[PDB]
Design an enzyme around this catalytic site. Sequence first.
Site, PDB file in Angstrom:
ATOM      1  N   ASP A 130       3.925  48.174  18.170  1.00 37.29           N
ATOM      2  CA  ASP A 130       2.818  48.753  17.456  1.00 37.29           C
ATOM      3  C   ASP A 130       2.589  48.016  16.140  1.00 37.29           C
ATOM      4  O   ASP A 130       3.423  47.226  15.727  1.00 37.29           O
ATOM      5  CB  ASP A 130       3.135  50.215  17.216  1.00 37.29           C
ATOM      6  CG  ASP A 130       1.907  51.061  16.973  1.00 37.29           C
ATOM      7  OD1 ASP A 130       0.779  50.524  16.820  1.00 37.29           O
ATOM      8  OD2 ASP A 130       2.097  52.290  16.949  1.00 37.29           O
ATOM      9  N   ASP A 136      -6.485  55.384  19.621  1.00 41.02           N
ATOM     10  CA  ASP A 136      -5.653  56.190  20.511  1.00 41.02           C
ATOM     11  C   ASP A 136      -6.487  57.157  21.341  1.00 41.02           C
ATOM     12  O   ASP A 136      -7.369  57.826  20.826  1.00 41.02           O
ATOM     13  CB  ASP A 136      -4.642  57.025  19.710  1.00 41.02           C
ATOM     14  CG  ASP A 136      -3.565  56.187  19.018  1.00 41.02           C
ATOM     15  OD1 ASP A 136      -3.559  54.948  19.147  1.00 41.02           O
ATOM     16  OD2 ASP A 136      -2.704  56.793  18.336  1.00 41.02           O
TER      17      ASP A 136
END
Lengths: 390, 390
Positions: free
Chosen positions: B139, B200
């Site tokens: 990430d 997301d």
Amino acid sequence: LDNGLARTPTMGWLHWERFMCNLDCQEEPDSCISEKLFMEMAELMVSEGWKDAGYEYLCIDDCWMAPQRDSEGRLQADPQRFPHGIRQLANYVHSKGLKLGIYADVGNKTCAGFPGSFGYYDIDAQTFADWGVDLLKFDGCYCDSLENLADGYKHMSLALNRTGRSIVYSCEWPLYMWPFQKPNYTEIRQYCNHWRNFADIDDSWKSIKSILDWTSFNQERIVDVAGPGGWNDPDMLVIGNFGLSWNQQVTQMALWAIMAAPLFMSNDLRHISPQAKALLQDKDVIAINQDPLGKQGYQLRQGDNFEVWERPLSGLAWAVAMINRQEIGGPRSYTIAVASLGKGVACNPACFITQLLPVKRKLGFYEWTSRLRSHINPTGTVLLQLENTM
Amino acid sequence: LDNGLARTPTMGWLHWERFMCNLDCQEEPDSCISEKLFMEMAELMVSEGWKDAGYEYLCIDDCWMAPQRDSEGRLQADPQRFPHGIRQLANYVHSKGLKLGIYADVGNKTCAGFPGSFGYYDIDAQTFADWGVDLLKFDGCYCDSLENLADGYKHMSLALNRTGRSIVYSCEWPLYMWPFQKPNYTEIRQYCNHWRNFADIDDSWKSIKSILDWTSFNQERIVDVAGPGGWNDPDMLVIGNFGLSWNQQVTQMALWAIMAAPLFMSNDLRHISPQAKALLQDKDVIAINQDPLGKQGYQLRQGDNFEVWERPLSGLAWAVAMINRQEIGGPRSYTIAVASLGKGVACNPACFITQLLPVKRKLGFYEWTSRLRSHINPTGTVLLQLENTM
Ligand SMILES: *[C@@H]1O[C@H](CO)[C@@H](O[C@@H]2O[C@H](CO)[C@@H](O[C@@H]3O[C@H](CO[C@H]4O[C@H](CO)[C@@H](O)[C@H](O)[C@@H]4O)[C@@H](O)[C@H](O[C@H]4O[C@H](CO)[C@@H](O)[C@H](O)[C@@H]4O)[C@@H]3O[C@@H]3OC[C@@H](O)[C@H](O)[C@H]3O)[C@H](O)[C@H]2NC(C)=O)[C@H](O[C@@H]2O[C@@H](C)[C@@H](O)[C@@H](O)[C@@H]2O)[C@H]1NC(C)=O
Ligand SMILES: *[C@@H]1O[C@H](CO)[C@@H](O[C@@H]2O[C@H](CO)[C@@H](O[C@@H]3O[C@H](CO)[C@@H](O)[C@H](O[C@H]4O[C@H](CO)[C@@H](O)[C@H](O)[C@@H]4O)[C@@H]3O[C@@H]3OC[C@@H](O)[C@H](O)[C@H]3O)[C@H](O)[C@H]2NC(C)=O)[C@H](O)[C@H]1NC(C)=O
Ligand SMILES: *[C@@H]1O[C@H](CO)[C@@H](O[C@@H]2O[C@H](CO)[C@@H](O[C@@H]3O[C@H](CO)[C@@H](O)[C@H](O)[C@@H]3O)[C@H](O)[C@H]2NC(C)=O)[C@H](O[C@@H]2O[C@@H](C)[C@@H](O)[C@@H](O)[C@@H]2O)[C@H]1NC(C)=O
Ligand SMILES: *[C@@H]1O[C@H](CO)[C@@H](O[C@@H]2O[C@H](CO)[C@@H](O)[C@H](O)[C@H]2NC(C)=O)[C@H](O[C@@H]2O[C@@H](C)[C@@H](O)[C@@H](O)[C@@H]2O)[C@H]1NC(C)=O
Ligand SMILES: *[C@@H]1O[C@H](CO)[C@@H](O)[C@H](O)[C@H]1NC(C)=O
Ligand SMILES: OC[C@H]1O[C@@H](O)[C@H](O)[C@@H](O)[C@H]1O
Ligand SMILES: OC[C@H]1O[C@@H](O)[C@H](O)[C@@H](O)[C@H]1O
Ligand SMILES: OC[C@H]1O[C@H](O)[C@H](O)[C@@H](O)[C@H]1O
Ligand SMILES: OC[C@H]1O[C@H](O)[C@H](O)[C@@H](O)[C@H]1O
């Protein structure tokens, strides 16, 4: 409106959201707006238990009319789609123990573009009474001025009254005032049995949320106006269609009960899941919506993507709904002091709590000092009933 | 990334959307992020047919770590939630015939606030390899500059490679780059097996729609970069959770197939509906996602709240998806000339068409000049496969 009707919120079925303005009987005979659609629905309202659960109005929305008035200045049913006319449909509906609703518009045209009732209020009221119509939904499109809007809604109300027939009068008056003037609900209540406040619902969670959010945002203006004979209309139930998850459907049913909303289903009764049917026919939830006291509920609390709504019921009981607005993750835990519910009197010295949605189960007795813990699915709602005893 | 992996899009299960960063094992032992959660999921992946359908990666997202590195500067699993450590979990997963995925971050901290790998890339790659990790999701949080971002992603890619262990490398490089600078996908493809492009996902139709809309908007930039070893990642499948209607779930499954997306479920395999299981395990749809040619699909057409997407398959076959984005009314009719499909070569001189979703059925042969008529539920999708023969 003091006409003896809508002493509890009106319950029924309305074609609009699911069937809309489908005029194509050649390609889509089984879903075009026609007398056959309504006759089939009327049969199913009886045979599938809808009438027994309380759904008694079978309502025709926009796009029933022919493009022109007849030679005597009357609205006419479309000759190809309603070849036997509205009177015969009304008689068929009445023969099943049901009531017939129809649609018209206060301005020059209906929202779909068919003939409006402006300049024809008495004639249209008389036509509807003669046909045996039991409910009129009266829309506000193509009305240029606000004073013509109000005068029109008042005039039609008085005209329906003068026929001597008992007709439920469903208005869209405050919705069409929205941009320009603050509605006076005392005035609206005097002339209407229910009134649409907000933009049209659609088959979506986004739409359910905006209706709930507009209502709680405006609850201080609208909640107290509601009561027997006069209800806020947050628009149709869209349960059993295509755009809502199971939990979002539960949310709509629970909150439309809390809001003392008229319950107009818009779905296809020929193709409805057993789950959707059980929810819409849920007798305990319907009993909350139809509570004789008719006090509209309200949002008590909001924070941490949770909302608590409550409704005072008859017999010192209360309905409580807890909504989880967090649209990620899993069931979230929520705890509330029962002394915060029902203005502090619901559970003093104690109350019995029954969960109604998403599943029915007795939770037991809760002392004034106790805490209620629940787990609430994302976009879902838990609905509780609080009583003195079981 | 030319490491021999992800020759078809990676399939697996990822905890994040459904279980998030739940650290409370006292109150919620069965849903906190712990070794027991993953061991239970691994068992179900085998016993409930998920591995057989192709889901082989069991992946741990953020919030597996202890708050500090150990005295040798290594990441450690949380001692209370993973008392037996990652190696033993990896061995357990491998013993079931599955592969283990884990999460880390290129910056100073993970998005949830645990230790980042910045300054520790080699140490961390080696730790993961020594544990037996088979996939790393990497990430981009808490990384100030874009040159540190790119260097970090490149460094970790090279470090994983130097371990000699076959590890799927899933990046979020373009997502953290896009806000400031156009990403270079030629460069990203060289270093990554898949890459997250967009915000997301959550358990909502709104989210699915924005991912689809961002992807079709940007399809010139991203569709041709994808292929065996290197995929666009539009984020997790959220089928079987709470926020999507049945039709919206079908839409996600069909489109993620068309898009050659990695298929990472994020749901609770212990509590999943039979319907959701059948959809996610649908072999013909999975066979489209996993097509050996690995050419990503694209939006061919949009208008009248309809969208047509298509994907070229091996054997001169094509997959076609038609989405109804009108969120009101009923099933809408859509007609398209088969000659518009597959750049005019899909049905020349003829093709056999099979509907896959929402239900499987053979539609017979269609000549080049023919027109295909379909009815598409609101927020739903029809997915077709076009072949030379049945
Ligand atoms: C660390 O990084 C290294 C890259 O920087 C990785 O090495 C690469 O690994 C690739 C995958 O193994 C490998 O690609 C393969 O090469 C084989 C031989 O190709 C040469 O010889 C051909 C003639 O026989 C010639 O035409 C080529 O031009 C090459 O010179 C070949 O057999 C492979 O093809 C088979 O497998 C692929 C699946 O990957 C199938 O698609 C294919 O149909 C066939 O079945 C493959 O060939 C091609 O490679 C180029 C690529 O663009 C094509 O898509 C692919 O088909 C590649 O050669 C090297 N690169 C370099 C620079 O060495 C390394 O991987 C490990 O090491 C290799 C040797 C192998 O053992 C892997 O299993 C290892 O993972 C990375 N290491 C780690 C730990 O990640
Ligand atoms: C056209 O307009 C006029 C109004 O200008 C309508 O007249 C009104 O008609 C209703 C008919 O129900 C009538 O209400 C009743 O009045 C008598 C007392 O005079 C009561 O016996 C009734 O109470 C009983 O029934 C109601 C059910 O509606 C129930 O609530 C009670 O518990 C009881 O069982 C009822 O009294 C009303 O009770 C509700 C309360 O909110 C009202 O204020 C109260 O009046 C009206 O009195 C009557 N008004 C006038 C001025 O005549 C007429 O019906 C309408 N015609 C058409 C066709 O629409
Ligand atoms: C919203 O509309 C309602 C209904 O019309 C208004 O309430 C009404 O206000 C009238 C005053 O303009 C009242 O009429 C009076 O009647 C008595 C007879 O008893 C006369 O002595 C007096 O001269 C008036 O003619 C009427 O009683 C009242 N109707 C009802 C059902 O309550 C309302 O006005 C506002 O609220 C009411 C309660 C009063 O406080 C008013 O002073 C106040 O303006 C309208 N709302 C607004 C914001 O204007
Ligand atoms: C995006 O990254 C690509 C891969 O790193 C760049 O291409 C590579 O550029 C190298 C010099 O920077 C050159 O030696 C390589 O041949 C080439 N590699 C490949 C696989 O094409 C690319 O650079 C642009 O395109 C190349 C062909 C040259 O024209 C450069 O001058 C360009 O900058 C990068 N593209 C961008 C827009 O940054
Ligand atoms: C609306 O209808 C009225 C009466 O039926 C008519 O006189 C008027 O011209 C119409 N208004 C417009 C704007 O067309
Ligand atoms: O404003 C919304 C609601 O607020 C409550 O506190 C009150 O008891 C209700 O009668 C209603 O006013
Ligand atoms: O519009 C984007 C798409 O256009 C197609 O014609 C092309 O074959 C695809 O590779 C993709 O680039
Ligand atoms: O055209 C019909 C349509 O008109 C308006 O939009 C109304 O608010 C709707 O409820 C429906 O009756
Ligand atoms: O905290 C974990 C979280 O971090 C970022 O938001 C990623 O994009 C998500 O997929 C998830 O991994």
